[PDB]
Subunit: 91 residues, 5 copies
């Protein structure tokens, strides 16, 4: 089984790794019958997107925001606007 | 999809942005049958709630409670202009 | 609609406001369900049971309230006011205000 | 209803109160399934377990007490089990 | 019933106890169908995953990561790779 985010990210289609090593600057959450958007100080902006796994990821990004912990890497779907998160590495 | 709260707000009917840039002064929660009511207010008196003008509603309530507990600044709210307290459609924390 | 705990409290039957401005001194939890909180003055309150108070009290909201009260206890944050039902002993919590 | 842990503990068959006033020294948990346990131990060797949603809640409370170093004041436990099974907890 | 992680680990088949006494250096979570994969790593390269929801264990590891609390021991199926976690002990 894949051992890290780079290996995991290769298993998906239309994805790439963003290496950020930064805390989340802005956290946005909206009712969508919830969409979650995060941005970083350099302006990189990502959205979340299944029920259960998506709630866990939304909780993780929310907690990261409130605690100011560093996001190391994201694996994202690059055919989406903003790009959609497949995996997260905190380190 | 829009990547900021201003444009997201524009996609709902009868909503507006309030720019706050301050921490929640009071957080109130009450039993209301199948759901809890959750009301927040700020130092200038602006009062807002979570209520549809399910799971996502719960998530919003938890975000506002966490914001209250931690004293984190609320940057913006997109709210519906229905009731006072106005219902929250979106939140931005920065 | 009501916009604060005082206005909300008047919508229920058999309630009162309790003015606290204190952190929770004692948190008690039992699985045989019951959550009880107490403050330095001896003021003691319980969380309601699902299906009580004309169905104003139901399982999922109560779980959320239990979460809030436990967080308040652990973090030492002040409870400003409670809206409490007086038809139970200890009085049971309808609403919580944190400030 | 009971107003404290002593009153509630008196309501059940084969329970007893242990007074601790100590922080949790060790927290152990296994995966959901038939072998799922949460086990807590204190400095003096005293060890307890949590044997639906009330069960979830109590496990969460113990885990948070460990993470934070909050003192456990009292436990109401069934002592027809080893480790004794927690019926109620008092934090103070 | 078991009273500690070693006794708990012996209720599983082909498990071992990996002693660590270290904080988690990296936390990775990823979307799969029906559940998220969760992978943790330590500074020495030791890498573990949660799999047989297993939501409680996932919550515990994430909280350990966020708070920097030490993971004392893991009971793992050490035939899996990365090894899958059956139980965790938190101690300092």
């Amino acid at each position: 089984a894949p051992q890290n985010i780079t290996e995991l990210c290769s298993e998906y289609h239309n994805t790439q790794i963003y290496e950020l090593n930064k805390e989340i600057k802005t956290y946005t959450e909206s009712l969508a019958g919830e969409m979650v958007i995060i941005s970083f100080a350099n302006g990189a902006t990502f959205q979340v997107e299944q029920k259960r796994p998506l709630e866990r990821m939304k909780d993780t990004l929310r907690a990261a925001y409130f605690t100011g912990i560093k996001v190391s890497k994201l694996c994202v779907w690059n055919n989406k606007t903003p790009n959609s998160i497949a995996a997260i590495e905190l380190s």
